[PDB]
Amino acid sequence: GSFYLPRLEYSTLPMAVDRGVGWKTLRDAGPVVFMNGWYYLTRREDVLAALRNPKVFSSRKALQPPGNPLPVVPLAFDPPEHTRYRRILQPYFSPAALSKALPSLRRHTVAMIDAIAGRGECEAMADLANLFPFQLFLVLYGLPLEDRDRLIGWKDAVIAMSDRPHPTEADVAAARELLEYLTAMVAERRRNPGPDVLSQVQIGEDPLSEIEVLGLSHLLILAGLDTVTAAVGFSLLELARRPQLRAMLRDNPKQIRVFIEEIVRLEPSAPVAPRVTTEPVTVGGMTLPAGSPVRLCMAAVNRDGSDAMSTDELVMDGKVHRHWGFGGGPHRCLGSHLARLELTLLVGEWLNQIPDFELAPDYAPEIRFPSKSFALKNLPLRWS
Ligand code: HEM
Ligand SMILES: [Cl-]
Ligand SMILES: [Cl-]
Ligand SMILES: [Cl-]
Ligand SMILES: [Cl-]
Ligand SMILES: [Cl-]
Ligand SMILES: [Cl-]
């Protein structure tokens, strides 16, 4: 039996400079590590089993908000409700379904790179990574392109206020404006359904309600955009400091795919998944009572050294690339195929117009830690 609970202060983890060092510090503390109210499960055997066991490791108990909120479709649901949502949404998010959008997404990506390439410099987060996901979101779901500025502003306000009592007056107005904006859209799509996703999920044999589509739309905006922003930054960072990799990847979709898998493996934008247990569980000989809040450490598992595909290094070769940067079990990222499509498009079109570039002088990449983001703070790039 394990009766001595390791405890760490989250804010002291050495995470700003090198995530490998940060996750190793946590993993080496033990299979179960208590930090700031949560039990972190750090080892592959436990993390993957837990992700794969929604009955025991509940998402709803960890993620259902208080009050009477918009339903967080499907993130905050357990089976059987979760299973229905995933069955309904799966066909719209498959590689084959999303591949049909590629000409449009490529055209918009090319235009975004076009405006940057002539400058010889940029700060890649503010100037591209922060803007690109919402741009493609408007394209994918048929929203007015001129609404990008205010939609990004609403998203940023809602994300920043989520973890914080005492909401600022500006914060509540932004949340209300976003809700009103999305509500009008969803109602129009129910009355006049086009061939698009948000229309089609509201009709057919098992239609979603307007409130369900509103909750889904909110979730896609809050969970599906900044995650890709973070991955764009890490993609361009690693390319900026690896000239021969840049050369190899230009016009090389097969290897760009491999590179993107490595970026998501090594710098997963959501490196832990929260759950609450529904019955006693024993992890590493330690028994946790029912109702225990746990955080499952996917990013640590991806780096645990247990095979050649799980090291702290960027590994471009090897016949197999696999990881849990998109999660695992039934909640595995609904948008994983979209994220891959968008990231590979971005890298390819960036290298087509900006094949050679470098970090600005005396720049040392860091994330803000602790914070609500595992993205780079900034990324100053130079070329020409
Ligand atoms: C590199 C980019 C991304 C990463 C690293 C990422 C990561 C993740 C992870 C780890 C989860 C599982 C959370 C959990 O188990 O509690 C998840 C779920 C989800 N993601 Fe992503 N994601 C990315 C992009 C996207 C995109 C582009 C979309 C859609 C536009 C999206 C939509 C969702 C949704 C709807 C869920 C909930 C699925 C469910 O609960 O069944 N994500 N994501
Ligand atoms: Cl909910
Ligand atoms: Cl300029
Ligand atoms: Cl797997
Ligand atoms: Cl490409
Ligand atoms: Cl500078
Ligand atoms: Cl900062």
Side-chain angles (χ1 to χ4, degrees), residues 1-67 69-162 165-168 170-253 255-318 320-371 373-383:
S2 194
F3 302 114
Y4 303 102
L5 174 61
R7 302 171 171 83
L8 294 179
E9 168 59 43
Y10 179 81
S11 73
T12 85
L13 284 178
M15 195 84 72
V17 168
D18 190 325
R19 262 59 66 204
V21 177
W23 297 123
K24 177 178 191 349
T25 303
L26 175 59
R27 165 193 326 120
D28 288 349
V32 181
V33 184
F34 191 80
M35 317 189 277
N36 305 84
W38 292 80
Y39 296 96
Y40 286 69
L41 306 194
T42 70
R43 309 299 174 77
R44 175 176 299 234
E45 52 265 40
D46 308 306
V47 167
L48 301 187
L51 285 167
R52 294 172 176 153
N53 193 344
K55 177 167 297 143
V56 174
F57 292 86
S58 166
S59 287
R60 182 148 198 76
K61 284 196 183 295
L63 296 163
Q64 190 199 339
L70 226 37
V72 190
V73 172
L75 180 78
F77 289 86
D78 296 343
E81 293 86 5
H82 176 259
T83 315
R84 161 167 178 273
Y85 286 137
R86 288 295 295 237
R87 152 169 8 109
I88 286 166
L89 296 165
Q90 178 269 341
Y92 304 99
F93 284 93
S94 66
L98 294 165
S99 74
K100 295 166 163 293
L102 193 39
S104 287
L105 303 181
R106 187 181 301 283
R107 172 167 71 253
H108 280 269
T109 301
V110 169
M112 285 189 87
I113 305 302
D114 275 349
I116 292 166
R119 289 175 57 192
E121 76 169 60
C122 69
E123 192 288 284
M125 308 308 294
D127 296 347
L128 181 57
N130 292 359
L131 310 172
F132 165 80
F134 225 133
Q135 177 70 19
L136 295 197
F137 184 92
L138 304 172
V139 172
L140 282 164
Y141 299 112
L143 300 172
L145 301 179
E146 64 265 19
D147 284 337
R148 196 184 76 197
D149 289 345
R150 60 184 176 144
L151 276 160
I152 284 174
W154 289 332
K155 165 181 69 69
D156 291 344
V158 172
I159 288 180
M161 73 182 200
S162 72
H166 309 106
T168 253
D171 288 341
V172 313
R176 179 199 65 232
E177 286 157 8
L178 176 67
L179 174 66
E180 287 171 22
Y181 179 93
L182 296 175
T183 297
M185 191 248 302
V186 166
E188 171 64 20
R189 306 262 166 128
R190 203 179 187 86
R191 293 192 296 265
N192 293 297
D196 59 278
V197 177
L198 296 183
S199 291
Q200 288 305 303
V201 287
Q202 294 195 74
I203 62 189
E205 210 91 328
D206 196 14
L208 299 180
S209 64
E210 289 190 50
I211 179 137
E212 280 172 327
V213 172
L214 266 171
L216 170 69
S217 294
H218 271 88
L219 177 63
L220 296 172
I221 286 167
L222 297 183
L225 304 181
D226 283 12
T227 47
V228 174
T229 292
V232 168
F234 287 114
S235 300
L236 294 175
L237 165 62
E238 295 299 352
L239 293 173
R241 55 188 182 184
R242 296 163 194 265
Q244 307 215 0
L245 177 63
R246 290 203 300 271
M248 262 322 293
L249 293 197
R250 191 180 195 196
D251 288 310
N252 193 347
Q255 288 309 106
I256 290 172
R257 179 201 74 90
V258 170
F259 173 69
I260 287 308
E261 294 304 311
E262 283 293 286
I263 293 297
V264 178
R265 178 176 74 79
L266 290 163
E267 307 279 5
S269 308
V272 309
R275 307 285 189 259
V276 170
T277 68
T278 68
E279 59 182 63
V281 303
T282 300
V283 174
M286 196 171 303
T287 298
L288 304 179
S292 286
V294 305
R295 272 169 177 163
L296 309 179
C297 293
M298 292 95 66
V301 168
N302 285 352
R303 289 163 172 267
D304 72 3
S306 64
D307 57 33
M309 301 168 290
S310 309
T311 75
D312 287 309
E313 330 280 342
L314 173 62
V315 177
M316 264 336 279
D317 53 20
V320 191
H321 286 84
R322 65 182 193 208
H323 62 85
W324 294 272
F326 289 118
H331 291 269
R332 179 272 293 153
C333 181
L334 179 65
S336 61
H337 310 294
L338 177 54
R340 291 172 168 117
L341 182 60
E342 293 185 336
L343 289 163
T344 58
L345 249 197
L346 189 289
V347 167
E349 295 304 338
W350 179 279
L351 294 171
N352 173 241
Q353 300 187 49
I354 312 172
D356 281 306
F357 59 103
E358 82 200 344
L359 301 178
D362 244 71
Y363 162 77
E366 300 193 0
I367 69 166
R368 179 169 173 91
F369 185 89
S371 89
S373 175
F374 275 73
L376 293 166
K377 297 190 296 194
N378 50 83
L379 179 55
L381 304 177
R382 308 291 183 258
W383 58 97

